[PDB]
Amino acid sequence: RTTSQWRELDAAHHLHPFTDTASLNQAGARVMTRGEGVYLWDSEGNKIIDGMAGLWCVNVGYGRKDFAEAARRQMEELPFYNTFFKTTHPAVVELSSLLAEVTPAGFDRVFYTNSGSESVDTMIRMVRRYWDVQGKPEKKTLIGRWNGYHGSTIGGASLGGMKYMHEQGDLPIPGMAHIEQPWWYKHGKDMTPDEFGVVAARWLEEKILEIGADKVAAFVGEPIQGAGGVIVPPATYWPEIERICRKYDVLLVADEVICGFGRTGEWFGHQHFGFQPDLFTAAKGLSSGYLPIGAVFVGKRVAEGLIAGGDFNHGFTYSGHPVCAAVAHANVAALRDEGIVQRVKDDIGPYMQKRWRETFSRFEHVDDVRGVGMVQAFTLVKNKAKRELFPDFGEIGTLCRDIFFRNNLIMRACGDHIVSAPPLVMTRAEVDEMLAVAERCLEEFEQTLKARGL
Amino acid sequence: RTTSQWRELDAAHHLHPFTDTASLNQAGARVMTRGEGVYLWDSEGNKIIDGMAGLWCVNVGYGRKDFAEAARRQMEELPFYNTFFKTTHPAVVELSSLLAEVTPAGFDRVFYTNSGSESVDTMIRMVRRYWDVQGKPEKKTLIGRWNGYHGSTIGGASLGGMKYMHEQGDLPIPGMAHIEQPWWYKHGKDMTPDEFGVVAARWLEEKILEIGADKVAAFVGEPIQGAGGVIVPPATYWPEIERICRKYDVLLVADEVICGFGRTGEWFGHQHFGFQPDLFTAAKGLSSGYLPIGAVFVGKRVAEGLIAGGDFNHGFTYSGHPVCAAVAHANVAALRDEGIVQRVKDDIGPYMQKRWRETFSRFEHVDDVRGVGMVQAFTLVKNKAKRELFPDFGEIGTLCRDIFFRNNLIMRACGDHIVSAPPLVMTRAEVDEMLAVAERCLEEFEQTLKARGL
Ligand SMILES: *Cc1c(COP(=O)(O)O)cnc(C)c1O
Ligand SMILES: *Cc1c(COP(=O)(O)O)cnc(C)c1O
């Protein structure tokens, strides 16, 4: 089948996530056919550097033949059985045991789902059920942040702070509130990042008192905001958020769907930033994207509460799916046993962060060069001196994104932020290869900008 | 590694869907280890007849080594790439094209998810977006039915009509309404099923008029209610429902997550009952549960509307997952090319239905014996003549279900309804084997019932 034929059928039959279907079909979709290591190939034979690891998720890289064997094997002995009928199976039990070993102490119990979005919905129902069991039926409001992302279920879309999502579905649903994000470049004023972190955290206390603590169930946040543009909060932020949650008896929830499983060099983002959530949600890197699986890790306090509540009338047919569990188990064992997470912390992470800042810090319209471990970013700005952003935030980002895409480099544009999260197994030489291409693209971007009078 | 050790680890680490964790952990979970055809084996070596096909989903049966090979091949080539970045891949394109061939005309476009619950959330958001595009922002209420089931996301749980789900999470969310279910045994009074079908359908009309039609976006229903107990509506019901929807310009949605992919003998439940929905939701049988995947099949009218609205800000990371799509393609090809669906319609379906009715007709406390294709059921009753149900609906069903499991037969109890949906590939010999066990179990049930208080 040819490229044109694949594009024709896709256009005729397939509706994509977060896309303008009419526009995509007119332009024709790029057809990705093969993956190896940190590279992809499309139907036209182009070799491509995947600086986004699929979608923040292919942490061990492409080409894991042993994962495929594990999946083949499980699918042959027991492709599926449910966990609804007072029933279980070996794959899900073994995964549960292994996860308990790589997660912080006090996270022994896990609830499985198919996606990060379902994980978030599960977490929402869990935190509300918890307060009901505690004898506090009014404590039901969850607080998230503007520009935070927590998936695409009705629940996750509501808890998320993307107005372009809220506007489709009559969202958010009741019992959801939002505070501003800890984006220093925009909101920092004449504060240092550290003093801004305290101020941005205290926005949470302001909202809790506005609503009434007796009505607030939880605060939920990504340790680093992903889809929002890799917004890295100041070091003072999460400790203050935690102090506030504790003061007002509000549950603290980390959404680890992106930061989870080695992304920051720690196993989980909350470990890097030094707070202790009562639950956290996961997916993506849990299986390195090799098969769909998500999870909610429930701390002991919330677990006991749920357990005391009897029946928990929640779950999905494919919860604990044997094949996905078998692959996830192989992935997590690899991340640990092959020293992949440790390598991010000790070796490739520090190297990436150094080289990232050496590469982009010299560009006239790049600023806020940032990142940790193997997630990094910067922002395209009109004038660094005034911290002035381009109008129509996102239009310039698209231009630069298309230049990357044309040059067979995948880095994503989130508004005018450029972000990257490559496979964790990326070599130092691969890191340098990617940056050399990225640098060339920014030079092309800089000239294209000046040449358009922008 | 022994039964005991898996049960200790499951208790210690695993939170299951729809169960009392405290009780299960005390009693011990049943460990399912392997499957072949229509049979399962547990860690204790018991051979089990799976009369529920996993969870209404293992439609081609266990042991498809060809599906495992399709999975392996795809996972080695491209285990994942996203469909977000103006990108696609051959597996999802191929599946989309095959699906268009087995779905009714006018359904050419499909949106992928990981589960039936995500499909329902997707459908809710599409339905509301569609009406926004029409310039009718108040046309946002979706109507479902009491005892309907549409998943376990916050959205799906709210649209579903299970009170016990509503009472956990503060559901339903706004813009949801419910009408009574077309359960003739309970609500039929002195009407014929056909007369009742019209009355029960008209409950939708009176609800629309109570709310106001300009505020009603859609009616959503399972052609046959699954988790509610295989409630089979009279022949007159769906045509009247459809007539009412057209009268009030209300979208009609079939939830085919169970009835889909051959369960009734047609490819889809709505084909059997002769109505034409504007969208329908799928999962389960889409891949015979071999991997998690779901879909929304979008008809031409709504597709046109979504497409006219530019960005559709919705979707999941693993939407259209290559490996899952490759396995679903294999499954759908098998259902068609191996004549499995046709065989349900022409051979095993009629046989099952005849034998089901022959088997359970004689029992004193069994009534409303029903079914179509390879979904069938009956209800345990205190007195047939009065159509008097036992009090504490569900307690007596539990008694009977337990007898089944002690005799290595899986049939589910939904309240006091006993239900069955075995793999579609079940042979006539296997049907008779299953019914011989079940008949024995019902004889024991009548015994104990009479022995300890009818
Ligand atoms: C991607 C993502 C989700 C949702 O995961 P899906 O698998 O796409 O449903 C939730 N939270 C965060 C932080 C994410 O990055
Ligand atoms: C099982 C089911 C769902 C939900 O599917 P999951 O894959 O469990 O999320 C939705 N609708 C119907 C009719 C179902 O039977």
PDB file of N, CA and C in Angstrom, chain B residues 231-267:
ATOM      1  N   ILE B 231     -32.050  -7.748  29.768  1.00  0.00           N
ATOM      2  CA  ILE B 231     -33.423  -7.315  29.612  1.00  0.00           C
ATOM      3  C   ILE B 231     -33.661  -7.148  28.113  1.00  0.00           C
ATOM      4  N   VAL B 232     -34.483  -8.031  27.559  1.00  0.00           N
ATOM      5  CA  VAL B 232     -34.757  -8.039  26.127  1.00  0.00           C
ATOM      6  C   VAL B 232     -36.056  -7.278  25.876  1.00  0.00           C
ATOM      7  N   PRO B 233     -35.991  -6.170  25.126  1.00  0.00           N
ATOM      8  CA  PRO B 233     -37.201  -5.362  24.942  1.00  0.00           C
ATOM      9  C   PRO B 233     -38.160  -5.972  23.928  1.00  0.00           C
ATOM     10  N   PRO B 234     -39.462  -5.691  24.069  1.00  0.00           N
ATOM     11  CA  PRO B 234     -40.429  -6.217  23.104  1.00  0.00           C
ATOM     12  C   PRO B 234     -40.083  -5.711  21.715  1.00  0.00           C
ATOM     13  N   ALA B 235     -40.585  -6.381  20.679  1.00  0.00           N
ATOM     14  CA  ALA B 235     -40.247  -6.055  19.299  1.00  0.00           C
ATOM     15  C   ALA B 235     -40.690  -4.651  18.918  1.00  0.00           C
ATOM     16  N   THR B 236     -41.685  -4.130  19.628  1.00  0.00           N
ATOM     17  CA  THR B 236     -42.264  -2.826  19.300  1.00  0.00           C
ATOM     18  C   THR B 236     -41.479  -1.632  19.871  1.00  0.00           C
ATOM     19  N   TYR B 237     -40.557  -1.905  20.781  1.00  0.00           N
ATOM     20  CA  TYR B 237     -39.914  -0.853  21.568  1.00  0.00           C
ATOM     21  C   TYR B 237     -38.979   0.048  20.765  1.00  0.00           C
ATOM     22  N   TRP B 238     -37.991  -0.539  20.106  1.00  0.00           N
ATOM     23  CA  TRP B 238     -36.961   0.264  19.469  1.00  0.00           C
ATOM     24  C   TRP B 238     -37.487   1.102  18.298  1.00  0.00           C
ATOM     25  N   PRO B 239     -38.383   0.535  17.479  1.00  0.00           N
ATOM     26  CA  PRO B 239     -38.955   1.364  16.409  1.00  0.00           C
ATOM     27  C   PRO B 239     -39.664   2.602  16.953  1.00  0.00           C
ATOM     28  N   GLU B 240     -40.360   2.449  18.079  1.00  0.00           N
ATOM     29  CA  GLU B 240     -41.061   3.568  18.697  1.00  0.00           C
ATOM     30  C   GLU B 240     -40.066   4.562  19.294  1.00  0.00           C
ATOM     31  N   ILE B 241     -39.051   4.057  19.990  1.00  0.00           N
ATOM     32  CA  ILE B 241     -37.959   4.908  20.464  1.00  0.00           C
ATOM     33  C   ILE B 241     -37.391   5.735  19.320  1.00  0.00           C
ATOM     34  N   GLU B 242     -37.095   5.083  18.198  1.00  0.00           N
ATOM     35  CA  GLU B 242     -36.540   5.802  17.047  1.00  0.00           C
ATOM     36  C   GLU B 242     -37.528   6.847  16.520  1.00  0.00           C
ATOM     37  N   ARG B 243     -38.804   6.486  16.443  1.00  0.00           N
ATOM     38  CA  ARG B 243     -39.812   7.430  15.960  1.00  0.00           C
ATOM     39  C   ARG B 243     -39.816   8.672  16.851  1.00  0.00           C
ATOM     40  N   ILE B 244     -39.768   8.447  18.158  1.00  0.00           N
ATOM     41  CA  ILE B 244     -39.781   9.543  19.117  1.00  0.00           C
ATOM     42  C   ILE B 244     -38.542  10.419  18.964  1.00  0.00           C
ATOM     43  N   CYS B 245     -37.376   9.800  18.809  1.00  0.00           N
ATOM     44  CA  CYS B 245     -36.151  10.580  18.646  1.00  0.00           C
ATOM     45  C   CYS B 245     -36.229  11.508  17.420  1.00  0.00           C
ATOM     46  N   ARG B 246     -36.686  10.974  16.293  1.00  0.00           N
ATOM     47  CA  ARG B 246     -36.824  11.784  15.086  1.00  0.00           C
ATOM     48  C   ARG B 246     -37.839  12.905  15.285  1.00  0.00           C
ATOM     49  N   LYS B 247     -38.931  12.607  15.982  1.00  0.00           N
ATOM     50  CA  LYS B 247     -39.978  13.598  16.192  1.00  0.00           C
ATOM     51  C   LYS B 247     -39.415  14.823  16.912  1.00  0.00           C
ATOM     52  N   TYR B 248     -38.520  14.603  17.876  1.00  0.00           N
ATOM     53  CA  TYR B 248     -38.018  15.701  18.699  1.00  0.00           C
ATOM     54  C   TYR B 248     -36.604  16.155  18.338  1.00  0.00           C
ATOM     55  N   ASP B 249     -36.078  15.656  17.218  1.00  0.00           N
ATOM     56  CA  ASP B 249     -34.730  16.011  16.763  1.00  0.00           C
ATOM     57  C   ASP B 249     -33.724  15.706  17.876  1.00  0.00           C
ATOM     58  N   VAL B 250     -33.796  14.478  18.361  1.00  0.00           N
ATOM     59  CA  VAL B 250     -32.932  13.991  19.426  1.00  0.00           C
ATOM     60  C   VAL B 250     -32.070  12.877  18.836  1.00  0.00           C
ATOM     61  N   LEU B 251     -30.760  12.924  19.077  1.00  0.00           N
ATOM     62  CA  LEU B 251     -29.858  11.912  18.523  1.00  0.00           C
ATOM     63  C   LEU B 251     -30.126  10.575  19.195  1.00  0.00           C
ATOM     64  N   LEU B 252     -29.992   9.502  18.427  1.00  0.00           N
ATOM     65  CA  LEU B 252     -30.217   8.157  18.932  1.00  0.00           C
ATOM     66  C   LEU B 252     -28.894   7.410  19.008  1.00  0.00           C
ATOM     67  N   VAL B 253     -28.566   6.910  20.197  1.00  0.00           N
ATOM     68  CA  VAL B 253     -27.283   6.262  20.427  1.00  0.00           C
ATOM     69  C   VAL B 253     -27.464   4.820  20.914  1.00  0.00           C
ATOM     70  N   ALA B 254     -26.837   3.877  20.222  1.00  0.00           N
ATOM     71  CA  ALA B 254     -26.816   2.495  20.684  1.00  0.00           C
ATOM     72  C   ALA B 254     -25.502   2.230  21.381  1.00  0.00           C
ATOM     73  N   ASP B 255     -25.567   1.665  22.582  1.00  0.00           N
ATOM     74  CA  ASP B 255     -24.373   1.170  23.229  1.00  0.00           C
ATOM     75  C   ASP B 255     -24.224  -0.308  22.871  1.00  0.00           C
ATOM     76  N   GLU B 256     -23.297  -0.583  21.956  1.00  0.00           N
ATOM     77  CA  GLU B 256     -23.086  -1.922  21.405  1.00  0.00           C
ATOM     78  C   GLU B 256     -21.894  -2.617  22.048  1.00  0.00           C
ATOM     79  N   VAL B 257     -21.456  -2.129  23.198  1.00  0.00           N
ATOM     80  CA  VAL B 257     -20.244  -2.665  23.780  1.00  0.00           C
ATOM     81  C   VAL B 257     -20.413  -4.169  23.989  1.00  0.00           C
ATOM     82  N   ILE B 258     -21.604  -4.602  24.384  1.00  0.00           N
ATOM     83  CA  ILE B 258     -21.877  -6.035  24.508  1.00  0.00           C
ATOM     84  C   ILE B 258     -22.502  -6.661  23.244  1.00  0.00           C
ATOM     85  N   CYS B 259     -23.604  -6.096  22.760  1.00  0.00           N
ATOM     86  CA  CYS B 259     -24.315  -6.672  21.612  1.00  0.00           C
ATOM     87  C   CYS B 259     -23.477  -6.636  20.333  1.00  0.00           C
ATOM     88  N   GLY B 260     -22.430  -5.820  20.332  1.00  0.00           N
ATOM     89  CA  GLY B 260     -21.597  -5.658  19.156  1.00  0.00           C
ATOM     90  C   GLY B 260     -20.782  -6.889  18.801  1.00  0.00           C
ATOM     91  N   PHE B 261     -20.475  -7.016  17.516  1.00  0.00           N
ATOM     92  CA  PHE B 261     -19.617  -8.078  17.002  1.00  0.00           C
ATOM     93  C   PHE B 261     -20.183  -9.483  17.208  1.00  0.00           C
ATOM     94  N   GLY B 262     -21.483  -9.611  16.947  1.00  0.00           N
ATOM     95  CA  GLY B 262     -22.075 -10.905  16.635  1.00  0.00           C
ATOM     96  C   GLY B 262     -22.915 -11.562  17.718  1.00  0.00           C
ATOM     97  N   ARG B 263     -23.016 -10.906  18.869  1.00  0.00           N
ATOM     98  CA  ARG B 263     -23.649 -11.492  20.042  1.00  0.00           C
ATOM     99  C   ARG B 263     -25.111 -11.895  19.778  1.00  0.00           C
ATOM    100  N   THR B 264     -25.852 -11.095  19.012  1.00  0.00           N
ATOM    101  CA  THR B 264     -27.260 -11.413  18.714  1.00  0.00           C
ATOM    102  C   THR B 264     -27.458 -12.226  17.427  1.00  0.00           C
ATOM    103  N   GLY B 265     -26.388 -12.435  16.667  1.00  0.00           N
ATOM    104  CA  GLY B 265     -26.491 -13.084  15.373  1.00  0.00           C
ATOM    105  C   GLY B 265     -26.340 -12.070  14.250  1.00  0.00           C
ATOM    106  N   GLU B 266     -26.630 -10.812  14.547  1.00  0.00           N
ATOM    107  CA  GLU B 266     -26.303  -9.731  13.630  1.00  0.00           C
ATOM    108  C   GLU B 266     -24.961  -9.190  14.073  1.00  0.00           C
ATOM    109  N   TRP B 267     -24.340  -8.366  13.246  1.00  0.00           N
ATOM    110  CA  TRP B 267     -23.082  -7.757  13.644  1.00  0.00           C
ATOM    111  C   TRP B 267     -23.296  -6.844  14.841  1.00  0.00           C
TER     112      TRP B 267
END
